[PDB]
Amino acid sequence: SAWRKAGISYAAYLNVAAQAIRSSLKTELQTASVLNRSQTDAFYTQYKNGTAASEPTPI
Amino acid sequence: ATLKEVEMRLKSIKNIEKITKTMKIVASTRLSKAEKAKISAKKMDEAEQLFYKNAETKNLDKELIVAITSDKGLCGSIHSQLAKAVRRHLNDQPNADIVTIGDKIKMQLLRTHPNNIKLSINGIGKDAPTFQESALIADKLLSVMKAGTYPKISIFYNDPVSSLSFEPSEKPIFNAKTIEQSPSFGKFEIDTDANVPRDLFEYTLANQMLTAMA
Amino acid sequence: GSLKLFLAQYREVAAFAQFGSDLDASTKQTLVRGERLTQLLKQNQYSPLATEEQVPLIYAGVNGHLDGIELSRIGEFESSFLSYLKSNHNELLTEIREKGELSKELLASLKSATESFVAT
Amino acid sequence: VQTGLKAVDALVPIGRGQRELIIGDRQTGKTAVALDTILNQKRWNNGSDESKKLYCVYVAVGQKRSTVAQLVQTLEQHDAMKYSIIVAATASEAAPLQYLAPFTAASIGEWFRDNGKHALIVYDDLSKQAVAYRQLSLLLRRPPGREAYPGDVFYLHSRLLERAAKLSEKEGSGSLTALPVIETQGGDVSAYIPTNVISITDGQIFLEAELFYKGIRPAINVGLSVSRVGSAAQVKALKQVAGSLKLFLAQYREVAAFAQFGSDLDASTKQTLVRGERLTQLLKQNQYSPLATEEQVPLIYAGVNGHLDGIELSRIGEFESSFLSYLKSNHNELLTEIREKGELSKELLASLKSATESFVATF
Amino acid sequence: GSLKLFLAQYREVAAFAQFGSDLDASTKQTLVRGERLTQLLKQNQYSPLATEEQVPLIYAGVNGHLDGIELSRIGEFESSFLSYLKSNHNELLTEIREKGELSKELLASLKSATESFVATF
Amino acid sequence: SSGLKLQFALPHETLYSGSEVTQVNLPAKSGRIGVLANHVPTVEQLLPGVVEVMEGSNSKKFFISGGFATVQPDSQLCVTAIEAFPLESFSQENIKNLLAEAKKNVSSSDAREAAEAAIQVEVLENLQSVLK
Amino acid sequence: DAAVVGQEHYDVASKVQETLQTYKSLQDIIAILGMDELSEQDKLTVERARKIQRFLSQPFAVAEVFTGIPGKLVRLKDTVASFKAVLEGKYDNIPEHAFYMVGGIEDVVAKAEKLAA
Amino acid sequence: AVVGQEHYDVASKVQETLQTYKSLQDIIAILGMDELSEQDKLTVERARKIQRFLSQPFAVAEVFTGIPGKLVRLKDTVASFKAVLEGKYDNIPEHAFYMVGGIEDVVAKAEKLAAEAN
Numbered sequence A: 001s002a003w004r005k006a007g008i009s010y011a012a013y014l015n016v017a018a019q020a021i022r023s024s025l026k027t028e029l030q031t032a033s034v035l036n037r038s039q040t041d042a043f044y045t046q047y048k049n050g051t052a053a054s055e056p057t058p059i
Numbered sequence B: 001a002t003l004k005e006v007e008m009r010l011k012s013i014k015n016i017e018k019i020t021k022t023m024k025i026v027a028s029t030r031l032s033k034a035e036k037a038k039i040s041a042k043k044m045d046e047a048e049q050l051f052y053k054n055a056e057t058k059n060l061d062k063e064l065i066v067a068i069t070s071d072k073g074l075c076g077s078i079h080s081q082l083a084k085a086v087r088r089h090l091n092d093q094p095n096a097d098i099v100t101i102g103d104k105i106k107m108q109l110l111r112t113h114p115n116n117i118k119l120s121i122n123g124i125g126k127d128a129p130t131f132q133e134s135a136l137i138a139d140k141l142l143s144v145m146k147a148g149t150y151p152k153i154s155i156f157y158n159d160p161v162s163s164l165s166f167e168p169s170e171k172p173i174f175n176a177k178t179i180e181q182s183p184s185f186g187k188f189e190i191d192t193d194a195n196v197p198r199d200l201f202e203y204t205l206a207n208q209m210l211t212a213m214a
Numbered sequence C: 001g002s003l004k005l006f007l008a009q010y011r012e013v014a015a016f017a018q019f020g021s022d023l024d025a026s027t028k029q030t031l032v033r034g035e036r037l038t039q040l041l042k043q044n045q046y047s048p049l050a051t052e053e054q055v056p057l058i059y060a061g062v063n064g065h066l067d068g069i070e071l072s073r074i075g076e077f078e079s080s081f082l083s084y085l086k087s088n089h090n091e092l093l094t095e096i097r098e099k100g101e102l103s104k105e106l107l108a109s110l111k112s113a114t115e116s117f118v119a120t
Numbered sequence D: 001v002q003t004g005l006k007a008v009d010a011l012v013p014i015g016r017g018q019r020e021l022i023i024g025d026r027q028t029g030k031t032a033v034a035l036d037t038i039l040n041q042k043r044w045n046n047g048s049d050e051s052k053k054l055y056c057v058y059v060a061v062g063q064k065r066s067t068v069a070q071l072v073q074t075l076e077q078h079d080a081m082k083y084s085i086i087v088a089a090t091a092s093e094a095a096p097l098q099y100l101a102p103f104t105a106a107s108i109g110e111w112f113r114d115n116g117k118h119a120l121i122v123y124d125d126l127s128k129q130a131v132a133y134r135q136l137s138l139l140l141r142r143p144p145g146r147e148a149y150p151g152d153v154f155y156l157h158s159r160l161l162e163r164a165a166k167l168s169e170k171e172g173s174g175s176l177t178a179l180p181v182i183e184t185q186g187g188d189v190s191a192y193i194p195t196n197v198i199s200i201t202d203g204q205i206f207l208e209a210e211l212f213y214k215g216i217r218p219a220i221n222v223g224l225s226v227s228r229v230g231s232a233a234q235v236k237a238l239k240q241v242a243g244s245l246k247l248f249l250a251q252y253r254e255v256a257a258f259a260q261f262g263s264d265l266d267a268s269t270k271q272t273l274v275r276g277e278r279l280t281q282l283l284k285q286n287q288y289s290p291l292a293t294e295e296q297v298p299l300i301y302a303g304v305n306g307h308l309d310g311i312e313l314s315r316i317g318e319f320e321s322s323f324l325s326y327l328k329s330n331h332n333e334l335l336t337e338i339r340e341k342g343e344l345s346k347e348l349l350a351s352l353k354s355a356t357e358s359f360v361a362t363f
Numbered sequence E: 001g002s003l004k005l006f007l008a009q010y011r012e013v014a015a016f017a018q019f020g021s022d023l024d025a026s027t028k029q030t031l032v033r034g035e036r037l038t039q040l041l042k043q044n045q046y047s048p049l050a051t052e053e054q055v056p057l058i059y060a061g062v063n064g065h066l067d068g069i070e071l072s073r074i075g076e077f078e079s080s081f082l083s084y085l086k087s088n089h090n091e092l093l094t095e096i097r098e099k100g101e102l103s104k105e106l107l108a109s110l111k112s113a114t115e116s117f118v119a120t121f
Numbered sequence F: 001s002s003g004l005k006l007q008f009a010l011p012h013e014t015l016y017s018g019s020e021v022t023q024v025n026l027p028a029k030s031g032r033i034g035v036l037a038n039h040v041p042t043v044e045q046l047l048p049g050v051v052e053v054m055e056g057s058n059s060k061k062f063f064i065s066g067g068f069a070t071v072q073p074d075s076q077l078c079v080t081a082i083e084a085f086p087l088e089s090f091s092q093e094n095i096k097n098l099l100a101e102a103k104k105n106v107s108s109s110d111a112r113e114a115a116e117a118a119i120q121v122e123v124l125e126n127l128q129s130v131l132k
Numbered sequence G: 001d002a003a004v005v006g007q008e009h010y011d012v013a014s015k016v017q018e019t020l021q022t023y024k025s026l027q028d029i030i031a032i033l034g035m036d037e038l039s040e041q042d043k044l045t046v047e048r049a050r051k052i053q054r055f056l057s058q059p060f061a062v063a064e065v066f067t068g069i070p071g072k073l074v075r076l077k078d079t080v081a082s083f084k085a086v087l088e089g090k091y092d093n094i095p096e097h098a099f100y101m102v103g104g105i106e107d108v109v110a111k112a113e114k115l116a117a
Numbered sequence H: 001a002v003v004g005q006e007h008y009d010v011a012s013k014v015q016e017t018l019q020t021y022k023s024l025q026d027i028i029a030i031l032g033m034d035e036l037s038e039q040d041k042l043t044v045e046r047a048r049k050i051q052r053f054l055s056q057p058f059a060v061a062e063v064f065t066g067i068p069g070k071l072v073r074l075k076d077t078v079a080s081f082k083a084v085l086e087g088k089y090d091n092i093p094e095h096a097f098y099m100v101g102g103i104e105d106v107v108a109k110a111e112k113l114a115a116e117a118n
């Protein structure tokens, strides 16, 4: 269950718990503020030294 | 210039006015909506930064550069002002690689130094950023970028001085290696068993980034 | 000198910076001096001024002594500047009246007389 | 003068003796307005009282025979010819015929007016008349004015429309209403002819093709359409629910651009959009389907208060159907009291509200 | 074939990229080619070009062999490419001229003649 | 200087800010820790557990996601986390088991995604003990 | 009129007109704010409006020398059935270029499949 | 075939540059230069520099401009604009191009404006 071994950064270690918690509550007391708070549509792309780039992927 | 060409053209300008005039009011709503995400990110920021105050953690004696921008346009001079600040700091350390967050700002620097760019982000200008997204972005900077090795890391964001003026801002991000050499460290009890300095970097890099975007 | 052409180019850069965008020092410097001259051109009706009284005002505008001066004080300044010459350097007024030309000597006596007033 | 058009009798009320102008581009729904009006008269003409009936006089100018033969054939399939007079002036006929048509028909209706009755005459259209008259005037070598129209062209229409009015009690209380039709060229209300007519009439029912395409039929531009007489000639039963309907729609046209933006709109403005979308959807009325005031009030009252806001903007159409049928079986006594009294007492206002909230609930 | 139609799409994309928004692979690909086709059409006065010299140029355009060339290069490219065929692949020019059409064989040779020149320089 | 000023804030909402507290109990990596008025300056990493702010009056207890905790020399503890959770009236047993069970099936799914499942198990199990 | 072309025919025709109208109404937003700013209901409509628009084009046997494509004669009974299907969103997957210069609705699917090769 | 190949090219470049400024004029009054792309924004400034440079003090109109006439030869004019196109004077302020004779006078006038700045 190592997180800093083959898991993710400490920022992600607390992240998984943030969504798990926010999703472990009542569905009635779950404002839309929390919904979009766990939603993201950002993609990252690695570039080279010659303006080159890698295949786009989801964060 | 016939009556019809003037009547058709005069009519399309009027449509534009309605589109812009409404864009402003709609903007006033997203403005207050970003204040709750701005104050909650500053107050929280002061909580973590308070530690670095009482405990000197300055950097003594390859560099990672991150620029916080959006992807949308029609925002005035925001993609020009920031692309100018990073440009000046780039003249002192050209070797220092850059990782801008925004397809828009990307093209700004992609013309001057298409080498330094080795990673970009898209799809953030939409709504207000959250820690859920911020921590995820900072995560890739440690996996494929390996920011832990870089001696000094710099961040670029726009600090709103007023509703009619902005100021480009820069704030360093001290890494693990810089936490040890901190002159005032002994005053704080700590166990060299849970990689406290190691796990502080991977977290500070997330929050500071979130207070920059928000 | 070249006051007409300057103003012509003034409106071009002035109406081009009225968007709110930030400009350089060159355009901004010309934008500050233009505004002072524009306000100086203003004049109430039924208030004719002698050529001798007009000459002094123009001189200050081109040189830039007015630039430092606040924009809302340009009006009071004109009425106060004329009184300064009559009360002090009246000789200059009588010279420009008859002669109608500024010699190389009167040019210097005038400069030292305006500069000294701008400071106070 | 109940036209049977919700968007009309609610927004731009017409009065016996008034001169309301039906101005609009080609193929907009100008004839539809008048045509429905005539059909909506079977509600009184087949009755017994005379001071309530309304004889209709249609003046076909410059229209091909095929069109007239159809226009007539429509009124028959609806049993409207029983009280309609057609003065046909086809385009193939000599110019002067198309010149005298409007005046000829004018007299015919005045008869009713003089004898103490009510007559509705629709000039469709004055635009064609002017063209005819222009032709005669030019051929006779009379001075040409703006757009080739002689100076007496205005004296023509002014001496025609002023013929319709409302006679006093001493004269016979008779009345002659006029609905002149003008065809603009690309919305150009600034043209010569239109400017003349619009200046003489007492209100316009401006129609736009664009509004037509969206679905809003009849496409009556509430913004422009106006009536100088207004409530003076509108049933108080509808006036009590229409006074506010002009308000909401007014603010809706101002905040119509916001509807195109994301949900980032505040709740205040959003509320307006909720109403407007639905209030505009209610005015949409199919052709050849006039409704009596007794059926209009219930629909307007439910709209203004906002009992439809909860209902989908797609089911607004069937809402009218099922709602009317409901009242005519459970609250028939309410409808009939509005038809006879013509007003809404505090008792009815409460009874109507209770019946509405009941149907909206069960819906 | 659809060259005129393509130049129509170009002006469609050229006007839409005015917004100042980034363009994907599709809208930029056609934008790259459409911009060069317009540069290939530019011809100097008093300089009529035979049919055997128009076909080759348009060929390399509609296909996409100029996409990988700078805009200020299209200029000399035309003259250089022509001189290339008149020296080496002149047989083809002679077939296009007489026949006035393109056979299955003529396309093959013409195809290879184009790619071979792109590789040069 | 009497008492200790607490600063419990989140990336979405701030609860306490320069507020005096009698006692606080927040889980640390080394182990469960407590703090009072005067406390030695310690900087420990907070793990997904349960925090409780104590007052002269009945003390409230909220569930924390995780972060860092630092007690400033000037007697000022600062708690930083992501999400927060009220007493118990917020979480539901039924809403937890649904995902909880699905987590064990994530180990069955590809390891890339199962890696995060292992981290969820822990947090979820602790949620059950909060029921008390 | 419904009482002429049929009730079904009128409704389908009216829907097509309303779609093309809103499309032309949002032309000021699709160039000034992009396609992303449009709502979920709007984007879905806009895409369709573009498909129907291109679906209205038809190759004539007379202008075969202009288009190069063989004339195509569509029957009214099939025509209405085609747009109807497209109005219901049954072909929101098919590419727009599959509706440009195409006769019957079957050809749309055939074309969309021939391009994929 | 008359004014020379270079003269033809330099002239054309001046036109294109001026033209591109005109085609975006509508945008400038509405939005501004902030909305202009990096490439477009550079052409504007350059263009505006070329336009101002076109002006020339007239000896006959000295009583209007108050500036002594300036007679410029064709040979120097071509080289002048060509040098501006190459981007060898993008540092010099636009004002220095207004009512200027010889290209040398531009750099001269640019230096005089440094002492006047306070």
Ligand SMILES: Nc1ncnc2c1ncn2[C@@H]1O[C@H](COP(=O)(O)OP(=O)(O)OP(=O)(O)O)[C@@H](O)[C@H]1O
Pocket (backbone or CB within 6 Å): D025, D026, D027, D028, D029, D030, D031, D032, D033, D183, D217, D218, D285, D286, D287, D288
């Ligand atoms: N209220 C309505 N509901 C549905 N369709 C309508 C309505 N009003 C008009 N139409 C349509 O309008 C068309 C004819 O419009 P109309 O005759 O009202 O315009 P017009 O003023 O007569 O134009 P023109 O000057 O060409 O006669 C018909 O095809 C009919 O389908």
Ligand SMILES: [Mg+2]
Pocket (backbone or CB within 6 Å): D030, D031, D124
């Ligand atoms: Mg008609």
